[PDB]
Design a protein around this ligand. Sequence first.
Ligand SMILES: *C/C=C(C)/C=C/C=C(C)/C=C/C1=C(C)CCCC1(C)C
Lengths: 133, 133
Amino acid sequence: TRDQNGTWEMESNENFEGYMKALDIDFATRKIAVRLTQTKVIDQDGDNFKDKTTSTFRNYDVDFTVGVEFDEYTKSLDNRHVKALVTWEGDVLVCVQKGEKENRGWKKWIEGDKLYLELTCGDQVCRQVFKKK
Amino acid sequence: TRDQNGTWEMESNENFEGYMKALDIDFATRKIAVRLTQTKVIDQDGDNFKDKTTSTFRNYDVDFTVGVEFDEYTKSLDNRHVKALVTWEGDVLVCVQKGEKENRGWKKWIEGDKLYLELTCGDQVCRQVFKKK
Ligand SMILES: *C/C=C(C)/C=C/C=C(C)/C=C/C1=C(C)CCCC1(C)C
């Protein structure tokens, strides 16, 4: 078939590094690129093609109900089991992940059109700010 | 407020390295992660949350008509101009990218539920396989 329409998810990628080196793509970029999954969206109508390639490293999906403890396997992060509980403290959503790691959890809250997330583990704190699309 | 619904685009990310290290995420993995932009999709109904964070690197878009030569600027790849021409050889879609690099182009074809993409540049060949979602 000549019909290449569809949404296509990468299954394998052989010698992407060699090809990128031939193009002179910088080292930093290649090191990232080889690790990414790619998704390809092809819109084909007769002889007209629109091709969109997107690259992704890892996803993280978590579902929870506030006030309901749950077993959480942090797959594709550090791969541990923790007992997670998310509760409200004012308008701050607060998560504690009980497990091997001390002081593990997070805080997530809104101010104006921005979302603030503070991730904690051990004595380390990571602070992230998101803007609404 | 407590409504955190929406699609959220990361604006900044402080000490992500510190946090991943405390989690014992491996060095190479940390170095890729710190570079990527994240998008957070939150679906909230009352106290029920579904959270999906996606880490992404680059995108590449190209539109063309089979048989019509066009100037391709490879923005976000090697940032060069090639005169690209895409043609059919049987059921294989074949592009030649004429410019500075020799043997530059690609081939795309369907076999079953799979899409095959061979990318070439200089003495290098990259082979990719995609499955329809
Ligand atoms: C017909 C479909 C084509 C030619 C798809 C081409 C996609 C690439 C040549 C991949 C480009 C990327 C890199 C070279 C590194 C950054 C990540 C990508 C996937 C955008």
